[PDB]
Design a protein around this ligand. Structure first.
Ligand SMILES: Nc1ncnc2c1ncn2[C@@H]1O[C@H](COP(=O)(O)O)[C@@H](OP(=O)(O)O)[C@H]1O
Ligand SMILES: Nc1ncnc2c1ncn2[C@@H]1O[C@H](COP(=O)(O)O)[C@@H](OP(=O)(O)O)[C@H]1O
Ligand SMILES: Nc1ncnc2c1ncn2[C@@H]1O[C@H](COP(=O)(O)O)[C@@H](OP(=O)(O)O)[C@H]1O
Ligand SMILES: Nc1ncnc2c1ncn2[C@@H]1O[C@H](COP(=O)(O)O)[C@@H](OP(=O)(O)O)[C@H]1O
Ligand SMILES: Nc1ncnc2c1ncn2[C@@H]1O[C@H](COP(=O)(O)O)[C@@H](OP(=O)(O)O)[C@H]1O
Ligand SMILES: Nc1ncnc2c1ncn2[C@@H]1O[C@H](COP(=O)(O)O)[C@@H](OP(=O)(O)O)[C@H]1O
Ligand SMILES: [Cl-]
Ligand SMILES: [Cl-]
Ligand SMILES: [Cl-]
Ligand SMILES: [Cl-]
Ligand SMILES: [Cl-]
Ligand SMILES: [Cl-]
Ligand SMILES: [Mg+2]
Ligand SMILES: [Mg+2]
Ligand SMILES: [Mg+2]
Ligand SMILES: [Mg+2]
Ligand SMILES: [Mg+2]
Ligand SMILES: [Mg+2]
Ligand SMILES: [Mg+2]
Ligand SMILES: [Mg+2]
Ligand SMILES: [Mg+2]
Lengths: 115, 117, 116
């Protein structure tokens, strides 16, 4: 039983942009917000959307969705020195993540692997 | 001997499915799925049919054949478990991993087929 | 340590189309351009777009993105006899790939698996 689950999510950026007009306090952890403070405009919108999509994708990979087991603030998406997104949450599994965002959409995928 | 036999992804414009809906469903949805579709309306029915189409198509790409003589729409059933997680049921010796998502205008599905040996 | 990495990419087709109207020579290898040479209109655009995205998604799977270790011309995406996309590049890993394209968007994903 190597793959524990997979999850994908697609988000319309304008939906996030609208929700941004305290939404970020609900989606992004303290560390993520400190990164977001240095972003603006479309970049901030796509960053928030990317994180949302990553966390949701991850919650689908576990099979529960955002809820009592896993919510937004239990997860932190960090970018490594190369810019590669790393998902940090308490779990026995290996989390593989990827994100992409065009001008109007963001997508994220997660593959959970047994350790 | 790869543990992953194949992967598949599909993106579908919801307005295209909505037009096709305006019988299309009898071709894409099995009987259990249509019974589930019966209780849906408007955007929900459209996104539901779209997600099924995409899950099935994505699965067929994971097998590497696409929808055709080996695999077609009616050989596959996508049911949601009690938590809402989509489960793909078809005759195969492999483990099927699936995920679906649908915004207001797009639906996306992905499949990863894993070897059970 | 089964999966070495995964990569996803979404591209707006009209963006690639604008870049087309030089560019293909930067994104497509010789073999790939000989295929593209027989395509036109939206089919050529989606084709190039799916290649861009496949190659970009592969580079994310590697964890470096397009750059000094992996660039577009180091990678060739072929279609087998059934139409399935096969990613050909220098690596010790098994490359799993998929592409999809609607009227307005192309998406590609990659899962890299370790051989051992
Ligand atoms: N000639 C070119 N060919 C391919 N990609 C290009 C390009 N010029 C810019 N880009 C990419 O398109 C995006 C536009 O960003 P910018 O505002 O700096 O132009 C950037 O990528 P990302 O979208 O991956 O960051 C950038 O790398
Ligand atoms: N038999 C098969 N198995 C897996 N993938 C396939 C396939 N035949 C075609 N594809 C992929 O499906 C892509 C298009 O998907 P969709 O029809 O969802 O847009 C193709 O884009 P290319 O033909 O540009 O390579 C191809 O890469
Ligand atoms: N607990 C759960 N785990 C994994 N996936 C789930 C889930 N609950 C719902 N989903 C999937 O998420 C899809 C919708 O994703 P999103 O909300 O991002 O649009 C659902 O589409 P269906 O209800 O059409 O099957 C369903 O397949
Ligand atoms: N304040 C909020 N923050 C984040 N998501 C919200 C929200 N209010 C509603 N949503 C989500 O956005 C969608 C809105 O649907 P509606 O408002 O018509 O019920 C639902 O998710 P899904 O699309 O995942 O089902 C819902 O859970
Ligand atoms: N070296 C790398 N390897 C893998 N993924 C990377 C990467 N550098 C950046 N990314 C991911 O690519 C995303 C953008 O994708 P695209 O260029 O296709 O829009 C980034 O979103 P964030 O910068 O918002 O975290 C990031 O998570
Ligand atoms: N009645 C039908 N039901 C489902 N799909 C159909 C269809 N008629 C055509 N298609 C699909 O619509 C796409 C474009 O149509 P055409 O090439 O005939 O103009 C093709 O798929 P792809 O987009 O996967 O190639 C084709 O297979
Ligand atoms: Cl959305
Ligand atoms: Cl992001
Ligand atoms: Cl959720
Ligand atoms: Cl098909
Ligand atoms: Cl784009
Ligand atoms: Cl890149
Ligand atoms: Mg969602
Ligand atoms: Mg982007
Ligand atoms: Mg398709
Ligand atoms: Mg949902
Ligand atoms: Mg939805
Ligand atoms: Mg990209
Ligand atoms: Mg980038
Ligand atoms: Mg097709
Ligand atoms: Mg297409």
């Amino acid at each position: 039983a190597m793959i524990v689950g997979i999850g994908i999510d697609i988000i319309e950026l304008n939906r996030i942009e609208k929700m941004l007009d305290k939404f970020m306090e609900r989606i992004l952890t303290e560390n993520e917000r400190n990164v977001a403070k240095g972003l603006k405009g479309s970049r901030l919108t796509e960053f928030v959307a990317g994180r949302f999509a990553a966390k949701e994708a991850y919650s689908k990979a576990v099979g529960t969705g955002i809820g009592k087991e896993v919510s937004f603030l239990d997860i932190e998406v960090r970018n490594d020195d190369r810019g590669k997104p790393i998902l940090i949450t308490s779990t026995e599994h290996i989390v593989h993540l990827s994100i992409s965002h065009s001008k109007e959409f963001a997508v994220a995928q997660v593959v959970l692997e047994s350790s």
